[PDB]
């Protein structure tokens, strides 16, 4: 099955966040940034909630020896986790995540403390390391069917203090890295030649992607390729900045404004406009898009808790409705922080992994409602049964 054929069956998505991407050196990294060892039962609960795909952020460079070889015991554990999903018919998007910045930062600056432009020696060295890693991953997973997708990077040059204002300059470098990932995977043949691969836009940012990373710059023609962006607007509601205290947003959507802490931008029309840009640039050209991460903070607040809860629901509804309508699959960012739900600061957690159950009910009702209201667009060249 090709990218269009799988895409229509992939929504909605969910992330195994703060799990296999944690930057620890051992298997114990899995429970370093969140408490719960992954099990089949937990994945079963993700499926039972209604998710059809799981993005598995994963670190690999941090799990490698000095010769670049990925620890065999780490590889085997990642495979077990992937298998929990495949056992359930869940689509998996397996990435190489921030991974201590080895390419996400140092592929684009020679310094982590200030912007220092990279040169050809840097770029070619990062290409080779990227291909090394992805050769190892691809070969381990070669006999996996179309349920397994690979995503080469995470959020290339997203680090604002280093890279803001350098997107035009850096996007050609990212194109080279995306191409190197695809080349390495495809070379391993077998199911890897037919697998759908996911390449990331500049800073996983919609505006920069549709500007600088037009479809003609992608490493393959349409068929077995998707494009990934992330979506965290407005940050004070979603949790990326100024997201607690007086600047925070608790209420989102006009129907949901209250006494204070109202969103002042980034509401439904903004979201729809942004997702439309992705339709124009990518999905209308046969490249399905994944919103590989999105979230809203579910909080406990002193003010109108019902209106906050409704805002969380409505945000998840809008993301998933509008994504579906535009040929986009959205993946909820979920780090298994149940405690934060019981504070003003909030949490984006939906699944209480320790109890294999949904705890973020507003968010999850919103996911379900949004997917039900959406209408996936089909881009076909032959008849399908439908
Ligand atoms: O050790 C990590 C390293 O991180 C660098 O930052 C990069 C790294 O961020 C990790 C956060 O990821 C974020 O999701 C990303 C997502 O991966 C991206 O794709 C993109 O979308 O952006 C988002 C946002 O950055 C997660 O949502 C976020 O939780 C991750 O943060 C790590 O969280 C661990 C778990 O704690 C969190 O959830 C549990 C809650 O109860 C906590 O409230 C909440 O913080 C943290 O591990 C825990 O660490 C504490 C000790 O640290 C704490 O106290 C000292 C402070 O300095 C620390 O900031 C604070 O966290 C332990 O006691 C506990 O046992 C342990 O579980 C972990 O520290 C934290 O980083 O990857 C994404 C990149 O974009 C980031 O640049 C930092 O730059 C580097 O300095 C270093 O911290
Ligand atoms: O009623 C207000 C307040 O009154 C005090 O007198 C009392 O001590 C407080 O408990 C109470 O605050 C609510 O507390 C409940 C939990 O209550 C139990 O534990 C504490 C005891 O003191 C109570 O007697 C017990 O019944 C909170 O409910 C929990 O809320 C979380 C988080 O909810 C949010 O995130 C998930 C989302 O789906 C929700 O809609 C959203 O509100 C839930 O996961 C949990 O199931 C639920 O028990 C309540 O939020 C406090 O206001």
């Amino acid at each position: 099955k090709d990218a269009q054929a799988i895409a229509k069956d992939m929504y909605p998505g969910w992330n195994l966040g703060n799990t296999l991407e944690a930057t620890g050196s051992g298997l114990d990294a899995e429970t370093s940034w969140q408490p719960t060892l992954t099990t089949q039962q937990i994945i079963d609960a993700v499926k039972a909630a209604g998710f059809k795909s799981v993005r598995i952020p994963c670190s690999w460079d941090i799990h490698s020896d000095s010769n670049g070889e990925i620890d065999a015991q780490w590889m085997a554990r990642v495979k077990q986790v992937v298998n929990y999903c495949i056992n359930d018919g869940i689509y998996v998007v397996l990435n190489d995540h921030w991974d201590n910045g080895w390419i996400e930062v140092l592929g684009f600056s020679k310094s982590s403390s200030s912007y220092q432009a990279v040169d050809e020696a840097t770029i070619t060295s990062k290409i080779t390391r990227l291909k090394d890693l992805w050769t190892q991953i691809a070969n381990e997973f070669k006999d996996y069917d179309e349920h397994l997708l690979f995503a080469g990077l995470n959020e290339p040059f997203q680090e604002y203090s280093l890279f803001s204002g350098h997107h035009e300059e850096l996007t050609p470098i990212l194109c080279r890295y995306n191409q190197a990932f695809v080349e390495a995977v495809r070379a391993t043949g077998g199911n890897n030649a037919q697998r759908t691969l996911v390449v990331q836009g500049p800073s996983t940012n919609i505006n920069s992607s549709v500007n600088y990373m037009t479809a003609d710059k992608l490493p393959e023609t349409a068929g077995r390729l998707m494009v990934e962006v992330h979506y965290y607007d407005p940050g004070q509601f979603c949790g990326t900045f100024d997201a607690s205290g007086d600047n925070a947003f608790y209420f989102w959507g006009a129907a949901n404004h209250s006494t204070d802490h109202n969103a002042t931008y980034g509401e439904e029309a903004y979201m729809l406009s942004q997702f439309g840009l992705l339709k124009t640039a990518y999905t209308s050209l046969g490249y399905p898009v994944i919103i590989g991460e999105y979230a809203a903070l579910q909080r406990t607040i002193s003010g109108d808790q019902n209106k906050h809860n409704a805002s969380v629901k409505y945000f998840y509804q809008c993301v998933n409705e509008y994504a579906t309508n535009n040929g986009i699959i959205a993946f909820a960012w979920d780090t298994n922080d149940t405690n934060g739900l019981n504070s003003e600061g909030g949490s984006s957690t939906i699944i209480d992994r320790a109890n294999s159950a949904v705890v973020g009910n507003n968010a999850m009702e919103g996911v379900k409602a949004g997917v039900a209201a959406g209408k996936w667009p089909f881009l076909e060249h032959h008849h399908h049964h439908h």
Side-chain angles (χ1 to χ4, degrees), residues 298-300 305 309 341-342 359-363:
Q298 172 68 72
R299 313 166 186 267
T300 298
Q305 186 72 47
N309 290 351
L341 300 171
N342 296 314
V359 63
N361 294 309
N362 306 307

CSV table of all heavy atoms in Angstrom, one decimal, residues 298-300 305 309 341-342 359-363, ligand 2:
chain,number,residue,atom,x,y,z
A,298,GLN,N,-4.4,20.6,29.2
A,298,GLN,CA,-5.5,20.4,30.1
A,298,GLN,C,-5.0,20.7,31.5
A,298,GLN,O,-4.1,20.1,32.0
A,298,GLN,CB,-5.9,18.9,30.0
A,298,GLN,CG,-7.0,18.5,31.1
A,298,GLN,CD,-8.3,19.1,30.8
A,298,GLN,OE1,-9.0,18.7,29.8
A,298,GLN,NE2,-8.8,20.1,31.6
A,299,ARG,N,-5.7,21.6,32.1
A,299,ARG,CA,-5.4,22.2,33.4
A,299,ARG,C,-6.5,22.0,34.4
A,299,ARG,O,-7.7,21.7,34.1
A,299,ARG,CB,-5.2,23.7,33.2
A,299,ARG,CG,-4.3,24.2,32.1
A,299,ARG,CD,-4.5,25.6,31.9
A,299,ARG,NE,-3.8,26.2,30.7
A,299,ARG,CZ,-2.6,26.7,30.6
A,299,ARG,NH1,-1.8,26.7,31.7
A,299,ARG,NH2,-2.1,27.2,29.5
A,300,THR,N,-6.2,22.3,35.7
A,300,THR,CA,-7.1,22.6,36.7
A,300,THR,C,-7.0,24.0,37.1
A,300,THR,O,-5.9,24.4,37.5
A,300,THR,CB,-6.9,21.7,37.9
A,300,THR,OG1,-7.2,20.3,37.5
A,300,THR,CG2,-7.9,22.0,39.1
A,305,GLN,N,-13.9,26.1,35.1
A,305,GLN,CA,-13.3,24.9,34.7
A,305,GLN,C,-14.1,24.3,33.5
A,305,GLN,O,-13.5,23.6,32.6
A,305,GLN,CB,-13.3,23.9,35.9
A,305,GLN,CG,-12.6,22.6,35.6
A,305,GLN,CD,-11.1,22.8,35.5
A,305,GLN,OE1,-10.5,23.4,36.3
A,305,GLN,NE2,-10.5,22.2,34.4
A,309,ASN,N,-12.4,23.2,30.0
A,309,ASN,CA,-12.5,21.8,29.5
A,309,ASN,C,-13.1,21.8,28.1
A,309,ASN,O,-12.7,21.1,27.2
A,309,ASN,CB,-13.4,21.0,30.5
A,309,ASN,CG,-12.8,20.7,31.8
A,309,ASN,OD1,-11.6,20.9,32.0
A,309,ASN,ND2,-13.6,20.1,32.7
A,341,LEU,N,-2.3,17.5,35.0
A,341,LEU,CA,-3.7,17.7,34.8
A,341,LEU,C,-4.3,18.4,36.0
A,341,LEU,O,-5.4,19.0,35.9
A,341,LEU,CB,-4.4,16.4,34.5
A,341,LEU,CG,-3.8,15.6,33.3
A,341,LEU,CD1,-4.4,14.3,33.2
A,341,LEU,CD2,-4.2,16.4,32.0
A,342,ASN,N,-3.8,18.1,37.2
A,342,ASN,CA,-4.3,18.6,38.5
A,342,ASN,C,-3.5,19.8,39.0
A,342,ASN,O,-3.5,20.1,40.1
A,342,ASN,CB,-4.2,17.5,39.6
A,342,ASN,CG,-5.0,16.3,39.2
A,342,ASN,OD1,-6.1,16.4,38.9
A,342,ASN,ND2,-4.4,15.2,39.3
A,359,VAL,N,-7.4,9.3,30.7
A,359,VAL,CA,-7.6,10.3,31.7
A,359,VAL,C,-7.9,11.6,31.1
A,359,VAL,O,-8.6,12.4,31.8
A,359,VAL,CB,-6.4,10.3,32.7
A,359,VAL,CG1,-5.1,10.7,32.0
A,359,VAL,CG2,-6.6,11.1,33.8
A,360,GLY,N,-7.4,12.0,30.0
A,360,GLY,CA,-7.7,13.3,29.3
A,360,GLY,C,-8.9,13.2,28.5
A,360,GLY,O,-8.9,13.2,27.3
A,361,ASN,N,-10.0,13.2,29.2
A,361,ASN,CA,-11.3,12.9,28.5
A,361,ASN,C,-11.7,14.1,27.6
A,361,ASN,O,-12.4,13.8,26.6
A,361,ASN,CB,-12.4,12.6,29.5
A,361,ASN,CG,-12.2,11.4,30.2
A,361,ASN,OD1,-12.0,10.3,29.6
A,361,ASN,ND2,-12.2,11.4,31.5
A,362,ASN,N,-11.5,15.3,28.0
A,362,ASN,CA,-11.9,16.4,27.1
A,362,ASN,C,-11.1,16.3,25.8
A,362,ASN,O,-11.8,16.4,24.7
A,362,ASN,CB,-11.7,17.8,27.8
A,362,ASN,CG,-12.4,17.7,29.1
A,362,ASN,OD1,-13.6,17.4,29.2
A,362,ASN,ND2,-11.8,18.0,30.2
A,363,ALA,N,-9.8,16.2,25.9
A,363,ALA,CA,-9.0,16.1,24.7
A,363,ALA,C,-9.5,14.9,23.8
A,363,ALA,O,-9.7,15.0,22.6
A,363,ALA,CB,-7.5,15.9,25.0
B,2,LIG,O1,-15.0,20.3,44.4
B,2,LIG,C1,-13.9,21.2,44.5
B,2,LIG,C2,-13.0,20.7,45.6
B,2,LIG,O2,-13.7,20.7,46.8
B,2,LIG,C3,-12.8,20.3,47.9
B,2,LIG,O3,-13.6,20.4,49.1
B,2,LIG,C4,-12.2,18.9,47.7
B,2,LIG,O4,-11.2,18.4,48.7
B,2,LIG,C5,-11.4,18.7,46.4
B,2,LIG,O5,-11.1,17.3,46.1
B,2,LIG,C6,-12.3,19.3,45.3
B,2,LIG,O6,-11.5,19.4,44.1
B,2,LIG,C7,-11.7,18.5,43.0
B,2,LIG,O7,-11.1,17.3,43.4
B,2,LIG,C8,-11.4,16.2,42.4
B,2,LIG,C9,-10.7,15.0,43.0
B,2,LIG,O8,-11.6,14.7,44.2
B,2,LIG,C10,-11.1,13.4,44.8
B,2,LIG,O9,-9.8,13.5,45.3
B,2,LIG,C11,-9.7,14.6,46.2
B,2,LIG,C12,-10.8,14.6,47.4
B,2,LIG,O10,-10.6,15.7,48.3
B,2,LIG,C13,-12.2,14.4,46.8
B,2,LIG,O11,-13.2,14.2,47.8
B,2,LIG,C14,-12.2,13.2,45.9
B,2,LIG,O12,-13.5,13.0,45.2
B,2,LIG,C15,-10.8,16.6,41.1
B,2,LIG,O13,-11.3,15.7,40.1
B,2,LIG,C16,-10.3,15.0,39.5
B,2,LIG,O14,-9.9,15.8,38.4
B,2,LIG,C17,-8.9,15.2,37.5
B,2,LIG,C18,-8.4,16.2,36.5
B,2,LIG,O15,-9.5,16.7,35.7
B,2,LIG,C19,-9.1,17.5,34.7
B,2,LIG,O16,-8.3,16.7,33.8
B,2,LIG,C20,-8.9,15.6,33.0
B,2,LIG,C21,-10.2,16.0,32.4
B,2,LIG,O17,-10.8,14.9,31.6
B,2,LIG,C22,-11.2,16.7,33.4
B,2,LIG,O18,-12.3,17.1,32.8
B,2,LIG,C23,-10.5,17.9,34.0
B,2,LIG,O19,-11.3,18.6,35.0
B,2,LIG,C24,-9.5,13.9,36.8
B,2,LIG,O20,-8.5,13.1,36.1
B,2,LIG,C25,-10.0,12.9,38.0
B,2,LIG,O21,-10.8,11.8,37.3
B,2,LIG,C26,-10.9,13.7,38.9
B,2,LIG,O22,-11.2,12.9,40.1
B,2,LIG,C27,-11.3,18.0,40.6
B,2,LIG,O23,-10.7,18.4,39.4
B,2,LIG,C28,-11.1,19.0,41.7
B,2,LIG,O24,-11.8,20.3,41.4
